[PDB]
Amino acid sequence: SWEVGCGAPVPLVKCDENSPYRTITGDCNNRRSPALGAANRALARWLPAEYEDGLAVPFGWTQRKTRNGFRVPLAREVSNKIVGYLDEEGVLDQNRSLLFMQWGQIVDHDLDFAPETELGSSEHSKVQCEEYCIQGDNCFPIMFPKNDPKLKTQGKCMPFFRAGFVCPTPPYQSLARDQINAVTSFLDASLVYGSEPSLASRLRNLSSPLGLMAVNQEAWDHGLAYPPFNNVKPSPCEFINTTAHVPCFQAGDSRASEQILLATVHTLLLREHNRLARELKRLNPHWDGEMLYQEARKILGAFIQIITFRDYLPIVLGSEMQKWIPPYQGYNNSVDPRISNVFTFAFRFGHMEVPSTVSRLDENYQPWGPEAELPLHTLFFNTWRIIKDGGIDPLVRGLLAKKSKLMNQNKMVTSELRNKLFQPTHKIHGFDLAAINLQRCRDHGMPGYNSWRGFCGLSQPKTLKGLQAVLKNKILAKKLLDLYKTPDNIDIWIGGNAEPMVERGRVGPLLACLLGRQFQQIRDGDRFWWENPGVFTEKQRDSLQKVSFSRLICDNTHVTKVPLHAFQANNYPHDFVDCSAVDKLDLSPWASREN
Ligand code: HEM
Ligand SMILES: *[C@@H]1O[C@H](CO)[C@@H](O[C@@H]2O[C@H](CO)[C@@H](O)[C@H](O)[C@H]2NC(C)=O)[C@H](O)[C@H]1NC(C)=O
Ligand SMILES: *[C@@H]1O[C@H](CO)[C@@H](O)[C@H](O)[C@H]1NC(C)=O
Ligand SMILES: *[C@@H]1O[C@H](CO)[C@@H](O)[C@H](O)[C@H]1NC(C)=O
Ligand SMILES: *[C@@H]1O[C@H](CO)[C@@H](O)[C@H](O)[C@H]1NC(C)=O
Ligand SMILES: O=N[O-]
Ligand SMILES: [Ca+2]
Ligand code: NA
Ligand code: NA
Numbered sequence: 362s363w364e365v366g367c368g369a370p371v372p373l374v375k376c377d378e379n380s381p382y383r384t385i386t387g388d389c390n391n392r393r394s395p396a397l398g399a400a401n402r403a404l405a406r407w408l409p410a411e412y413e414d415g416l417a418v419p420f421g422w423t424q425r426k427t428r429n430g431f432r433v434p435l436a437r438e439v440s441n442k443i444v445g446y447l448d449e450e451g452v453l454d455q456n457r458s459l460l461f462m463q464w465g466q467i468v469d470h471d472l473d474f475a476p477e478t479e480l481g482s483s484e485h486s487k488v489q490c491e492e493y494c495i496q497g498d499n500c501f502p503i504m505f506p507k508n509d510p511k512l513k514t515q516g517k518c519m520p521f522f523r524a525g526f527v528c529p530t531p532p533y534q535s536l537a538r539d540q541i542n543a544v545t546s547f548l549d550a551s552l553v554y555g556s557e558p559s560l561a562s563r564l565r566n567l568s569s570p571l572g573l574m575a576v577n578q579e580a581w582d583h584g585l586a587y588p589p590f591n592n593v594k595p596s597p598c599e600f601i602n603t604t605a606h607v608p609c610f611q612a613g614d615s616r617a618s619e620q621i622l623l624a625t626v627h628t629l630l631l632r633e634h635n636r637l638a639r640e641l642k643r644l645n646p647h648w649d650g651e652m653l654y655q656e657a658r659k660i661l662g663a664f665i666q667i668i669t670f671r672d673y674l675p676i677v678l679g680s681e682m683q684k685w686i687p688p689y690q691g692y693n694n695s696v697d698p699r700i701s702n703v704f705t706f707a708f709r710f711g712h713m714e715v716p717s718t719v720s721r722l723d724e725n726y727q728p729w730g731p732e733a734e735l736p737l738h739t740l741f742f743n744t745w746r747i748i749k750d751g752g753i754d755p756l757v758r759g760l761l762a763k764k765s766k767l768m769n770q771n772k773m774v775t776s777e778l779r780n781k782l783f784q785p786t787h788k789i790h791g792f793d794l795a796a797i798n799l800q801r802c803r804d805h806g807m808p809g810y811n812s813w814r815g816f817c818g819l820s821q822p823k824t825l826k827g828l829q830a831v832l833k834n835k836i837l838a839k840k841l842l843d844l845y846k847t848p849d850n851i852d853i854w855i856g857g858n859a860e861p862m863v864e865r866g867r868v869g870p871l872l873a874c875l876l877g878r879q880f881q882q883i884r885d886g887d888r889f890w891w892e893n894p895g896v897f898t899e900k901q902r903d904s905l906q907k908v909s910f911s912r913l914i915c916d917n918t919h920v921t922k923v924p925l926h927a928f929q930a931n932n933y934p935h936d937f938v939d940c941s942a943v944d945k946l947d948l949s950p951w952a953s954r955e956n
Contacts, residue, residue, distance in 0.1 A: 363536030367528045370401050382655045383662070383889045385554060385561040387545030390888045391694060398546035398698035398886070400556035403527040403539035404475065405699035408816060410537035410806030417526070417538035419501065419803040428809070434844035436799035437519070438506035439855060443840055444795040445779050446772040449717045453764040454930065457676070457714070457867065460910060461928050462765040463622045464673050465711040467630075470552045470614045470623075471665060472708070472883065473700045474543040475805070477522040487520075491787070494518035501804060503796045511780075515791050521800050539702070540805050544614065546700045547887050548669060550662045552614035553630045564589075564613060565654060572638045572653025574631055575611075582752035583919055588612055588624075588631050597742035597785035605745035621719060621740040621747060625756045628747075632917035634661055637948070644952045656951065663891035664908045664946075666884075672910070672928050674880055678873050679866025685877025689884065692893045698886030700879065702805050703813065706854045707875040709798050710868050713768040713858055717775045721755030726762045726922070726933030729755040738781035738790050754918050761914075761924060762933050768858065768867065770837045795855075802852040810856030810871075811849045817874035822848045833861050900950035907944035915940035 374396065376389035383390065384399075391397040412418050413426045420426075421433040446452075454461070478499040480486055490500035494517045502518040505511050511519075524540040526533070545551040553574075555561040566573035577587035588610040591598075598609035598618050609618035610627060617627045637657035641648065648656070675682045719740055721729035728734065729751055740746065747753065766775065774795045782792035811821040822828040828838040828848050837859060845851045851859075860869025868876065889896055891905060911923035921940050924931035931937065 364534055367534050367536070368396060368402060369527075369529070371396050374399070382659060383545075383547065383549055385545075385551075385558055386556065387547050387549070387551070390547060390698065391886070392888070393694060400543055400545045400551070401541060402699070404473070404542050404702040404705065404805075405697060406537075406539065407701045407703055408808045408812060410539070410702075411808045411812070412537060412806045415537065416535070417533060417806070419523075419806065421800075421803050422496070422501065428850045429847055431846040431850055433803070433850060435506050436503050436796040436803075436852075437509060437511075437793060439799055439844055439852070440774075440779060440793050440795040441506065441509060442844060443837070443855060443859075444773045445776065446769075447776075448772070449775065452766055452769060452772050452775075453716060454714070454767040454867075455764070456930050457765040457767075458761055458924075458928055458930055459622070459716070459719075459763040459765055460760045461673075461676070461867075462711055462714040462716075463626055463760055464668065464910070464928070465677075465708070465714065466623055467552065467626050468548070468665075468669050468673065469708050469711065470544070470616055471548055471550065472544065472546060473705045474614070474616070475524040475540040475705060476543050478525050480522065487786070490522065491520040494520075499523045501800065503793070503800050511791065515789070519792055519796065520787065521797065521804075523804050524801065537806060540705075542700050542705075546698050546883060547889065548662070548666050548883050549889070550613070550630070550658065550665050552617070552627070553612065553634060553661060554658055555613040560613065564611065567650070570650035570653075571642055572648075572650045572655070572657060574634050574638075576631070576635065580748050582628075582747075582754075585753070585918065586632055586635060587628060587748070588617070591618075595786075597783070598744045600785075600788060601742050601783065602745050605749060607745035607748045609742060609744060618742055618744055620737065621743050622756060622760060624744060624747060625753055625760065628753050629757075629913055629917050630661065630665075633664070633913055634658070636916055637661065640948050641951060644948060645955075647955060648953070659889075659896075660905075660946075660951075662889070663897065663905050664913070666891050667905060667908050668910055670880070670884065672926075676865070676928055677867050678863070678877055680864040681866060681870070681873035681877055685874065686881050686884070689890070689892050692888055692890060693885045694888070696882050696886030698883055700883075701875075703807065703853060703875055704879040705805070706798070706802055706807060707857055707872050707879070709854055710768070710858055710872055710876075712778060712794055712798065713773050714765045714867070715775060715778055716764070716766040717777050719756070720759040720763050721751055722758035722762055723755065724922075726758055726937070729758075736781075737775065737777035738783070741783040741790070742785065754920055757914055757918050757920050761920075761927060761931055761937075764930050768862065770832070770834050770859065770861070773858065798854045799852045802854050807853045809849050810851035810853060813853050813857070813871055813875065817871055819870055819874070832859050834859075898950060904947045904950050908946055909943060911940075911943045912945065915943055916946075 374388040387399040590608040778794040
């Protein structure tokens, strides 16, 4: 590094070296370096940051500053020319359920968050950014190109605030700026429990010694729990329907209500903790609240790791799974567990897997009611459609029986995200997630497409003809090179996602390498990885081996018809069985005769 020891929140970290449980922060996982993978630290840099000043200024900031002798294109122009499409017909993934998309977003939220600069206080600064489109300090607005329809309806820009960074802010260091990871790098259910002590405590039911998570007191789903409401104002979930007045959920991760299927899977996970905490209390009436909370927590962390490494990563990485994530050979304390800055963009492949609609299905997997299918844009920050329109069950059936979107070089990101995104504090369904992704690549100082190709041992196309061959597409390579005059300048998010998918996978060679390395490291560099000797007993592991998403549904909803392989495209009733035919988590090996 340029100057080490610039980590302000490094201290106040006590390591009980015999504790059988993870910290909330992720401190004390690595014994020799105890901050490694802990929250509220710098994202790791796999390659030096690239900024137009070599330190923090993002490419695209200064009109008269080139990248490699060319102007970088406007993020929104890249979005309009390359990313957008009109026809949703034929865009669905014939072999991935909608759950495939949704598990991706859940795993992402466990691993990484780079919060926008902390400028919540009411200020003319928001006005200078949103109203006047003035680029300065944290405001780095997404300017509309000529002939952008949004010019006619929304003004000259979309507001965009720079990501927060480590080390004091105005006293910025002379090392290049590093954005923060606000959650734990470990795959540890931090999205359920939180990554900070305050929130972890607020989420818990301390009113009784049962090791329960707090549940909603104002609303229930046929006797099953909802998460508590976030009772701080203003609330974006209230803002999208001021008649319903249904706030956002409060969970371990601040983004839990961003869309209704994310809030859905959070509700399943919360329910599973309290189900585990109740069953643990029955098997061990002696155990106190703290031990019931910790033991349920450790079980839920192991469930998330198994679904992710056994069911999810193999059908993302396809042929490349074995090359980057070979069979576990145990905990390696030399491995860096930190999430990389580049991974936070590589894992944004899910955005091209989001389809244009969400469905509510009844017990026969037929349309639930007469508004059963809803445009996705109406479901950002939407809790009221869960609380007041049928609970979780209909949305869970949609997750099983509907398909993910397939990424397509011609049809990359649905207009529901590309033109109609709602951002809290922006009060309009008018934002562009693709343009935001590209602006954020530049904000975070990302090296370009060919730097990452090099990193991954892959060819670095220099010509139109070279880029055609790597993308296997003539027209997409021409459109990219018309905006970015050299492949060296292509932003990693659009470059990575433009590559044709590997055999049996859903990402191309570059993303398979960036994702594969990151997931290898979070497994190998985790002292509390479930399969690491000593973390669980052998008998605990033979039990954990039989977890499944279908089982999580069976145990936490009144859905009684599930598929055996919940990530593949499943149709009702042919691919569906009764819950009785799905393996159970045998909790008999957590029976502690402790006398
Ligand atoms: C309807 C579904 C989804 C919505 C509405 C959504 C929305 C967003 C938004 C608004 C951001 C922040 C953009 C920024 O300011 O830079 C974001 C970031 C991100 N999204 Fe998505 N997304 C969705 C699905 C997914 C999926 C399916 C995945 C993965 C499979 C994913 C992975 C990510 C990641 C990794 C980030 C960066 C998180 C970080 O800060 O470290 N998203 N998403
Ligand atoms: C705001 O949410 C309300 C409250 O759920 C929605 O209305 C319910 O929805 C329809 C009427 O449009 C009926 O099926 C229910 O009987 C309504 N209940 C109440 C209290 O009115 C309303 O549609 C939502 N509005 C918007 C603009 O999203
Ligand atoms: C906490 O647990 C008690 C006893 O089980 C229950 O009655 C109460 O509603 C719970 N509180 C919250 C906020 O979840
Ligand atoms: C542990 O990780 C280091 C880091 O590069 C690696 O070189 C080494 O071979 C690994 N050893 C074991 C036994 O896992
Ligand atoms: C569908 O995907 C699964 C993995 O989820 C795979 O084993 C199966 O062969 C695929 N089926 C088809 C028809 O492509
Ligand atoms: O999940 N996005 O805020
Ligand atoms: Ca985590
Ligand atoms: Na809090
Ligand atoms: Na969000």
